[PDB]
Design an enzyme around this catalytic site. Structure first.
Site, short mmCIF file in Angstrom:
data_model
loop_
_atom_site.label_atom_id
_atom_site.label_comp_id
_atom_site.label_asym_id
_atom_site.label_seq_id
_atom_site.Cartn_x
_atom_site.Cartn_y
_atom_site.Cartn_z
N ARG B 28 3.79 -2.57 6.39
CA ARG B 28 4.03 -3.38 5.20
C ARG B 28 5.50 -3.45 4.82
O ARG B 28 5.84 -3.54 3.63
CB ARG B 28 3.24 -2.90 3.98
CG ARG B 28 1.80 -3.28 3.98
CD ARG B 28 1.29 -3.05 2.60
NE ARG B 28 0.02 -2.33 2.63
CZ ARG B 28 -0.79 -2.17 1.59
NH1 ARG B 28 -0.46 -2.69 0.40
NH2 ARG B 28 -1.96 -1.54 1.75
N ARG B 32 5.34 -6.66 -1.06
CA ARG B 32 5.70 -6.93 -2.46
C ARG B 32 6.80 -6.07 -3.07
O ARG B 32 7.36 -6.43 -4.11
CB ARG B 32 4.45 -6.92 -3.35
CG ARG B 32 3.38 -7.93 -2.93
CD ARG B 32 2.31 -8.11 -4.01
NE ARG B 32 2.83 -8.76 -5.21
CZ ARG B 32 3.08 -10.06 -5.32
NH1 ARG B 32 2.84 -10.88 -4.30
NH2 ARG B 32 3.58 -10.55 -6.45
N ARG B 41 6.40 -15.80 -1.18
CA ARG B 41 4.95 -15.81 -1.24
C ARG B 41 4.45 -16.69 -2.39
O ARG B 41 3.38 -17.30 -2.28
CB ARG B 41 4.42 -14.38 -1.38
CG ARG B 41 3.41 -14.00 -0.31
CD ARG B 41 2.12 -14.78 -0.51
NE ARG B 41 1.40 -15.04 0.73
CZ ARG B 41 0.72 -14.13 1.42
NH1 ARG B 41 0.67 -12.87 1.02
NH2 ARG B 41 0.02 -14.51 2.49
N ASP B 77 -2.46 -11.08 7.79
CA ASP B 77 -3.47 -10.36 7.04
C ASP B 77 -4.63 -10.07 7.98
O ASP B 77 -5.01 -10.94 8.77
CB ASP B 77 -3.93 -11.21 5.86
CG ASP B 77 -4.98 -10.52 5.01
OD1 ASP B 77 -5.17 -9.29 5.15
OD2 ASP B 77 -5.60 -11.22 4.18
N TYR B 155 -14.97 -5.02 5.24
CA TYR B 155 -14.52 -6.09 4.36
C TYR B 155 -15.54 -7.20 4.27
O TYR B 155 -15.74 -7.77 3.21
CB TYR B 155 -13.22 -6.67 4.83
CG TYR B 155 -12.08 -5.81 4.45
CD1 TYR B 155 -11.41 -5.04 5.40
CD2 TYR B 155 -11.67 -5.73 3.12
CE1 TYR B 155 -10.37 -4.20 5.03
CE2 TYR B 155 -10.63 -4.89 2.74
CZ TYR B 155 -9.99 -4.13 3.71
OH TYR B 155 -8.97 -3.29 3.34
#
EC number: 4.1.1.37
Lengths: 357, 357
Positions: B28, B32, B41, B77, B155
């Site tokens: 990552r 963010r 983004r 992702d 998921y």
């Protein structure tokens, strides 16, 4: 002045003695998976049906009416301690356990009560224990409990649950002093609380370090382990000084595979394991002195009764008949079938005897 | 027809070769925590600023402009695969990754696409990889990635995150056949997808088995491990048959301490570790053949730059200069300071050289 204990298999195994069979009990045996639990709990809010001795007693006794469990654990909540320290809880049906105003700054510690006065605030728990001990009438032992210092700190800082404990762990790295201070306040409150549970009639004690896994070996030995050690040491000392006989103490560190070795020397008679640690490797790590309390994947109960028996058989074969107390790897889940919990209990009793005969 | 690689330290270490210093990168790294990441983004929704090759390329390159990382990982992702299989995602700012309509019944498998057609649905990722490989101009290697079969299944069944994976695990115990079927569909889709990433220019691959820890040894070897093994085997075979040179493959099993031994024989050049496993014990478990990719507690970056350097020094001392790629124990957190990420990178480079000189 309580009834004399009839079945003490749980206590003997806890002390490391040989038993005719392997004793078994389930974390959260008094839980939402039982229809009778939701009804009784629906009397009022969480901290009202928990504040009523008779109610807590009934909840504690409910699973024992269904299954021949070898021990009962008082029904309560690990959050009673932070609450007793002065933190407000807003238990909602959706979220569950929550502190609308979590600790975030070092200054936030000033609003907590002197840990010395916490015991007097938890009198209702003591009353429920004495009552449950009386009503059990010596059928099986009564386990008292509390959350470990670190785990309680995570709830107080996070305000509730979290998949990372980022806020709590940030405290450890950015505020190590304040973290030590909070952890000490939590220790000084747990000791008199746990001692009080024994005074009220608890015949064993379990410390839940449910959020051990979020820390690594280094942080764990630095901030969690010291207090886990202090609790056991101080509780034993106060019980002796009070003329009472110390009780067997269990340390449960969920996802604490990395600390099994340290925990086996932490001053607890039993070391609870989660389902991710293989029994045999756990035995290696802990040694041959302590008793292992143990680990079936709670979700394993979703399998058929037949599959459960087999999984139980294999679990017992790995642990061996010596120094072992059967249990799940974690508390029961709300959607589990009571009949499958019965099968688990029955399977442990059946196979443990075969593993001996 | 891509630029020739200038710094290949990451690749050499991955293959087990000695290097002048220890290579480092962060899961990552394009995240963010970088102000520039949120702005870029914020162009459109998740699956739009991800569907734009130029956008994904820019996000991938952003961390490299700040830090001398020894590898770049394509920005994407893990949920792109389930999506490409026919599942609708409703990425909201609060919850994040979510499937409003999760798989729950075996019948729910009928709505998924033939795994063979998934690669053609993920063309935008391939385009972003080729583009990023071109723009990187051989500075450092480009890592491609995907989620492992079990993790993707969690998921798809859970609909998003979960602290217990109760619904997914219930599938394993109650629906083992349907679970195997779904896991196979996920394998048959990942192979052509991962091969396509290499064809498009990826010079390494990482399979994220982020939800490995929810399973125990038994379930893991039964339902997760077989597919983890199939992916590596099949990807290598197709790359050779296509005349391409296989790339080094990394298997990351978060909270997978119990499977380190099996994973080191799963057919991957590198085994990623989380921060809970002590480096030395990990080395014992994995052996002396594979390369370990490794584990600083991401939260450790909350400490001062000085404290980070020391923690990094100790981490390197434990891993040793051989067969090791530095990294965090998990992806970076959104509130982390870019300057502290720089310090981590710098510390690894500085100390790894000292540990050699």
């Amino acid at each position: 002045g309580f009834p004399e204990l009839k079945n003490d298999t749980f206590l003997r195994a806890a002390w490391g003695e040989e038993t005719d069979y392997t004793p078994v009990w389930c974390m959260r045996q008094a839980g939402r998976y039982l229809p009778e639990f939701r009804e009784t709990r629906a009397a009022q809010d969480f901290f009202s049906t928990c504040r009523s001795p008779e109610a807590c007693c009934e909840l504690t006794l409910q699973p024992l009416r269904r299954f021949p469990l070898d021990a009962a654990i008082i029904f309560s909540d690990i959050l009673v301690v932070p609450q007793a320290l002065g933190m407000e809880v807003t238990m909602v049906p959706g979220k569950g356990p929550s502190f609308p105003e979590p600790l975030r700054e070092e200054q936030d510690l000033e609003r907590l009560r002197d840990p010395e006065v916490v015991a007097s605030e938890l009198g209702y728990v003591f009353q429920a224990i004495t009552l449950t001990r009386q009503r059990l009438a010596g059928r099986v032992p009564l386990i008292g409990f509390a959350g470990a210092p670190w785990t309680l700190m995570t709830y107080m800082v996070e305000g509730g649950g979290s998949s990372t404990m980022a806020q709590a762990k940030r405290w450890l790295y950015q505020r190590p002093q304040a973290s030590h201070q909070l952890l000490r306040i939590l220790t000084d409150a747990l000791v008199p609380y746990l001692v009080g549970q024994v005074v009220a009639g608890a015949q064993a004690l379990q410390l839940f370090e449910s959020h051990a896994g979020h820390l690594g070996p280094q942080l764990f030995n630095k901030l969690a382990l010291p207090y886990i050690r202090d609790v056991a040491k101080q509780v034993k000392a106060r019980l002796r000084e009070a003329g009472l006989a110390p009780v067997p103490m269990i340390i449960f560190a969920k996802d604490g595979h990395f600390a099994l070795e340290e925990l086996a020397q932490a001053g607890y008679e039993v070391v609870g394991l989660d389902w991710t640690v293989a029994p045999k490797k756990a035995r290696e790590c802990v040694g041959k002195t302590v008793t292992l309390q143990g680990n079936l994947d709670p979700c394993a109960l979703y399998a058929s009764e037949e599959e459960i028996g087999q999984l139980v058989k294999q679990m017992l074969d790995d642990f061996g008949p010596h120094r072992y107390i059967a249990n799940l790897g974690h508390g029961l889940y709300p959607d589990m079938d009571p009949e499958h919990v019965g099968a688990f209990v029955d399977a442990v009793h059946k196979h443990s005897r075969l593993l001996r005969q």
